[PDB]
Paper text:
An accurate estimate of the background can be obtained by averaging near-convergence density, in real space and after local alignment, from dozens (>30) of independently measured but approximately identical ground-state crystals. In contrast, [name] directly eliminates the thousands of strong electron density blobs with no statistical significance, objectively identifying only regions that are unique to each data set; the ground-state data sets are provided by the many hit-free crystals. Using an averaged ground-state map for subtraction, as opposed to a single ground-state map, reduces experimental noise in the ground-state estimate and thereby also in the event map. Finally, the averaging generates an estimate of the ground state that can be used directly as density, bypassing the need for any subjective modelling and map interpretation. All crystallographic data used for the [name] analysis must also be made available so that the analysis may be reproduced. The group deposition feature recently added by the PDB22 makes it realistic to deposit all the many changed- and ground-state structures, as well as event maps (see Data Availability).
In this work, we show that unencumbered views of the changed, non-ground state can be obtained by recasting the problem as a multi-data set, 3D background-correction problem, which allows the relevant signal to be extracted from conventional single-data set density. Our new method—Pan-Dataset Density Analysis ([name])—comprises: the characterization of a set of related crystallographic data sets of the same crystal form; the identification of (binding) events; and the subtraction of ground state density to reveal clear density for events. We demonstrate the power of the method by applying it to the most demanding type of changed-state study, namely crystallographic fragment screening, which attempts to observe in electron density the rare and often low occupancy binding events that occur when a relatively large (200–1,000) library of weak-binding ‘fragment' compounds (150–300 Da, 100 μM–10 mM)1819 are added individually or as cocktails to a series of equivalent crystals. Applied to a series of fragment screens, [name] yielded markedly more hits than manual inspection of density, far more quickly and all with high confidence, in both known binding sites and new allosteric sites.
Residue numbers in the entry: 701 to 878
């Protein structure tokens, strides 16, 4: 196994996957690393299994169909994994915890959103369709862009949105287009 957390790239109290070399902090893994379970397989491994069980699941899909899917166990897991891929980028720090808004010439968003709130909502099974999860993720970056206006800090929202969207297209096998 690796000697650093796959998510945050720090050492510490690490749980090791039994089927690949990755390791995790308890609350860095999504879902949080399970109490017992020997062997234990990490979310990367569980996603790879889904793909292997149904190779056709990698054929192209339309986004509109993916969004309307109900949050059955496999879609729950895919959302968890997509959330985790965003936390994997260090720039996710800016979007993890509850924001506050007090900048001359700007007004805060009507509906604040942040990664830890999405993580709690997934954990509590609050989303009934993929669309709910995706809407809240895209809302994080849209709120940021609107609030920061012409400040160059707006770019952080563009950057982490790009990581979200690339991973969304990969995990849900969105049909490639020009
Ligand atoms: Zn970690
Ligand atoms: Zn693994
Ligand atoms: Zn199949």
């Amino acid at each position: 196994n690796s000697n650093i957390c796959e998510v945050c790239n720090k050492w510490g109290r690490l749980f090791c996957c039994d089927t690949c070399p990755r390791s995790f902090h308890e609350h860095c893994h999504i879902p949080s690393v399970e109490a017992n379970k020997n062997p234990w397989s990490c979310i990367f491994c569980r996603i790879k299994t889904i793909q292997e069980r149904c190779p056709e699941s990698q054929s192209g899909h339309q986004e509109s169909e993916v969004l309307m899917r109900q949050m059955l166990p496999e879609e729950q897991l895919k959302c968890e994994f997509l959330l985790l891929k965003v936390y994997c980028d260090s720039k996710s720090c800016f979007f993890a915890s509850e924001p506050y808004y007090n900048r001359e010439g700007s007004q805060g968003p009507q509906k604040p959103m942040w990664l830890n709130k999405v993580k709690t909502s997934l954990n509590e099974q609050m989303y009934t369709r993929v669309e709910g999860f995706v809407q809240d993720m895209r809302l994080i970056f849209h709120n940021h862009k609107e609030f920061y206006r012409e400040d160059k800090f707006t770019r952080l929202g563009i950057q982490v949105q790009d990581i979200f969207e690339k991973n969304f297209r990969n995990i849900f096998a969105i049909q490639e287009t020009s």
